[PDB]
Ligand binder design. Structure first.
Ligand code: CLA
Ligand code: CLA
Ligand code: CLA
Ligand code: CLA
Ligand code: CLA
Ligand SMILES: CCCCCCCCCCCCCCCC(=O)OC[C@H](CO[C@@H]1O[C@H](CS(=O)(=O)O)[C@@H](O)[C@H](O)[C@H]1O)OC(=O)CCCCCCCCCCCCCCC
Ligand SMILES: CCCCCCCCCCCCCCCC(=O)OC[C@H](COP(=O)(O)OC[C@@H](O)CO)OC(=O)CCCCCCCCCCCCCCC
Ligand SMILES: CCCCCCCCCCCCCCCC(=O)OC[C@H](COP(=O)(O)OC[C@@H](O)CO)OC(=O)CCCCCCCCCCCCCCC
Ligand SMILES: CC1=C(/C=C/C(C)=C/C=C/C(C)=C/C=C/C=C(C)/C=C/C=C(C)/C=C/C2=C(C)CCCC2(C)C)C(C)(C)CCC1
Ligand SMILES: CC1=C(/C=C/C(C)=C/C=C/C(C)=C/C=C/C=C(C)/C=C/C=C(C)/C=C/C2=C(C)CCCC2(C)C)C(C)(C)CCC1
Lengths: 57, 122
C-alpha cells in the first residue's frame, strides 16, 4: 500500500476530507492556544511587573 | 413610617446604619454638669482596603481595594457606653458592650482571601 510518509495523500482528490483534515488541524492549533494560555495563567505571577515581568517567567 | 422586621428581613437594610436627613446640620449642647451615654453606636463599613507587601523593602506599598466575599454581615451595631465629659472640655467615649466585632473576608486580585476581625472592642 502507501508508505508511511504518504498516508495523507489520500486527501489530494478529496476536497471534503481535505477540509475535514484542515478543520482538525485548526481545532488542534486553537486548542493548543487555549491550553497554553491556561497553563501560563496557572503559573504566571502578576505581582511585580518591574522585576518579575512575563518575559522573565 | 417606622419599619418592622418583616419589612427589613432579607433586604440588606439590617446591615445598614440609620441615616439622618440632609437638614440636620444642627448642634447638640453638652451640659458639663450632666452625664451622658451612648444608646447605640452603629458602624457600617463600605470600603475595605488592604496594604500590599512588595518584596523589595522599599517601593510604593499602598492600600489596594478589595472585594467583600462574606456578604452583608459586616456592620457593628447596638454598641453602648458612657460618654464622659472631661475636665478640659473634651468628650471621651468608653465602649462598654455591643455587637462590636464582625469577621470579614475580603479578596484581593489573584484570589488571596484576607480574613479580619473588624472590631471596635474596648
Ligand atoms: C503546510 C505544510 C505542509 C503540508 C500540508 C504538507 C503535506 C504533505 N506533505 Mg509535505 N513537507 C512540508 C510541509 C507540508 N507538507 C515541510 C515543511 C517539509 C520539510 C520538513 C515537507 C517535506 C515532505 C516530504 C519529504 C514528503 C512530504 C509529503 C507530504 C504529503 C503526505 C504527508 C504525509 O503523509 O506524512 C505523514 C506523516 C507521518 C505519518 C508522521 C510524521 C512525523 C514527523 C516526522 C514528526 C512529527 C510532526 C509533528 C507531529 C507535527 C508538528 C507540526 C509542526 C509544523 C509544528 C502531504 C501532501 C510526502 C509526499 O509528498 O508524498 C507523495 C513526502 O514524501 N512532505
Ligand atoms: C493534524 C493532525 C492530523 C490529521 C488531521 C490527520 C488525518 C488523517 N490521518 Mg494522519 N497522522 C498524524 C496527524 C494527522 N493525521 C500523525 C501525528 C501521525 C503519526 C502518528 C499520523 C499517521 C497516520 C497514519 C499511519 C494514517 C494516518 C491516516 C489519516 C487519515 C485518517 C485518520 C486516521 O486513521 O488517523 C490515524 C490516527 C492517528 C494518526 C492518531 C494520532 C496519534 C497521535 C500520537 C496523537 C494521539 C493523541 C494523544 C492522546 C496525545 C498524547 C499526549 C501525550 C503528551 C501523553 C486522516 C486524513 C490514515 C490514512 O488514511 O492513510 C491512508 C493512516 O493510515 N495518519
Ligand atoms: C465564498 C465564500 C467562502 C468563505 C467565507 C470561505 C472561507 C474559508 N474557506 Mg474557502 N472555499 C470557497 C469559498 C469560501 N471560503 C469555495 C467556493 C471553495 C471551493 C469549494 C473553497 C475551498 C476551500 C478549501 C479546500 C478550504 C477552504 C477553507 C476556508 C477557511 C480558511 C480559514 C479558516 O479556517 O479560519 C478559521 C475558522 C474560523 C475562525 C471559524 C469560521 C467560521 C465560519 C466562517 C462559519 C462556519 C459556519 C458556516 C455555515 C460553514 C460554511 C462556511 C464556508 C462557506 C467556508 C475559511 C473559513 C479551508 C478550511 O476549511 O480550513 C479549515 C480549506 O481547507 N475553502
Ligand atoms: C504557520 C503555522 C503552521 C504550519 C504551516 C503547520 C504545518 C503542519 N502542521 Mg501544524 N501546528 C501549528 C502550526 C503550523 N503547522 C501550531 C501552532 C500547532 C500547535 C502546537 C500545530 C500542531 C500540529 C499537530 C498536532 C500536527 C500538526 C501537523 C502539521 C503538518 C500537516 C501536514 C502533513 O501531513 O505534513 C507531513 C509531516 C511533515 C511534513 C513533517 C513536518 C516536520 C515539522 C515541520 C518539523 C520537524 C519536527 C521534528 C521532526 C520532530 C520534533 C520533535 C519531536 C520530539 C516532537 C503540517 C506540516 C501534523 C503532522 O505533522 O502530521 C503528521 C500534526 O499531527 N501541527
Ligand atoms: C476567530 C477569530 C480569532 C481571534 C480574534 C483570535 C485572537 C487571538 N489569537 Mg487565536 N486562533 C484562531 C482564531 C482567533 N484568534 C484560530 C481559528 C486558530 C487556529 C489556527 C487560532 C490559533 C492561535 C494560536 C496558536 C495563538 C493565537 C493567539 C491569539 C491572540 C493573539 C493574536 C496574534 O498575535 O496573531 C498574530 C496574527 C498574525 C500575525 C496574522 C498574520 C497574517 C499573515 C501574515 C497573512 C499571510 C497571508 C495573507 C493572506 C497574504 C495576503 C494579505 C492581503 C491583505 C494582501 C488573540 C487573542 C496567540 C495567543 O496568545 O494564544 C493564547 C497564539 O499563540 N490563536
Ligand atoms: C491515551 C490513549 C487513549 C486515548 C483515547 C482517545 C480516544 C480515541 C480512541 C478510539 C479510537 C477510535 C478510532 C477507530 C474507530 C473508527 O473506526 O474510526 C472513526 C473514524 C472514521 O469512522 C469510521 O469510518 C470508516 C470509514 S472512513 O474512514 O470514513 O472512510 C469506517 O471504517 C468505520 O466504520 C467508521 O466508524 O476515524 C477516526 O476518526 C480516526 C481515528 C481517531 C483518531 C483519534 C485522535 C484523537 C481525537 C482527537 C483529540 C484531539 C482533539 C483536540 C482538538 C479538538
Ligand atoms: C506528536 C506526535 C508525533 C507522532 C509520532 C510519530 C513520529 C514518526 C516517526 C517516524 C520515523 C520514521 C522512520 C522510518 C524509517 C523507514 O521506514 O525507512 C524505510 C523507508 C523506505 O521505505 P520505502 O519507500 O521503501 O517504503 C517501504 C514502506 O513500507 C515504508 O512504509 O525510508 C523512509 O522512511 C525514508 C527515511 C529514511 C530513514 C532511514 C534512517 C535509517 C538510518 C539509521 C540512523 C541511525 C544510526 C545512526 C548512527 C550514526
Ligand atoms: C512526510 C514526512 C517528512 C518528514 C520530515 C522530515 C524533516 C527532516 C529535515 C529535512 C532533511 C530532509 C532530507 C530528506 C531526503 C528526502 O528528500 O526524502 C524524500 C522522501 C520521499 O521520497 P520518495 O517519495 O522519492 O521516496 C523515496 C523512498 O521511496 C525511499 O527509497 O521523503 C522521505 O522519505 C520522508 C521521510 C523522511 C523521514 C525523516 C525521519 C523522521 C524522523 C522523525 C523522528 C521524530 C521523533 C518523534 C518523537 C515523537
Ligand atoms: C468537543 C467540544 C468541546 C471541547 C473542546 C476541548 C476541551 C478541546 C481541547 C483541546 C485541546 C486541549 C487541545 C490541545 C492541543 C495541543 C496540541 C495540538 C499540542 C501540540 C504539541 C506539539 C506539536 C509539540 C511539539 C513539541 C514537543 C513535544 C517538544 C518540543 C518541540 C515541539 C514544540 C515541536 C466544547 C465543550 C468546548 C465545545 C463542544 C464540543
Ligand atoms: C455530542 C456528544 C458527546 C460529545 C463528545 C465530544 C465532541 C467529545 C470530544 C472530545 C474531545 C475533543 C476531547 C479532547 C481531548 C483533548 C486532549 C486529551 C488534549 C490534551 C492536551 C494536552 C495534553 C495539553 C498539554 C499542554 C499544552 C499543549 C501546552 C500547555 C501545557 C500543557 C502541558 C497543559 C458525548 C459523547 C459526550 C455524549 C453526548 C453526545
Amino acid at each position: 500500500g502507501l508508505p508511511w510518509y504518504r498516508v495523507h495523500t489520500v486527501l489530494i482528490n478529496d476536497p471534503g476530507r481535505l477540509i475535514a483534515a484542515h478543520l482538525m488541524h485548526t481545532a488542534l492549533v486553537a486548542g493548543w492556544a487555549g491550553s497554553m494560555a491556561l497553563y501560563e495563567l496557572a503559573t504566571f505571577d502578576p505581582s511585580d511587573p518591574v522585576l518579575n515581568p512575563m518575559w522573565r517567567q | 413610617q417606622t419599619l418592622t422586621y418583616d419589612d427589613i428581613v432579607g433586604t440588606g437594610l439590617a446591615n445598614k446604619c440609620p441615616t439622618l436627613d440632609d437638614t440636620a446640620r444642627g448642634a447638640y449642647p453638652i451640659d458639663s454638669s450632666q452625664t451622658y451615654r451612648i444608646a447605640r453606636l452603629c458602624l457600617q463599613p463600605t470600603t475595605f482596603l488592604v496594604k500590599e507587601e512588595p518584596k523589595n523593602k522599599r517601593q510604593e506599598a499602598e492600600f489596594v481595594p478589595t472585594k467583600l466575599v462574606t456578604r452583608e454581615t459586616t456592620s457593628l451595631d447596638q454598641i453602648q457606653g458612657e460618654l464622659k465629659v472631661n475636665s478640659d472640655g473634651s468628650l471621651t467615649f468608653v465602649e462598654e458592650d455591643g455587637i462590636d466585632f464582625q469577621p470579614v473576608t475580603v479578596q484581593m486580585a489573584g484570589g488571596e482571601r484576607i480574613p479580619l476581625l473588624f472590631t471596635v472592642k474596648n
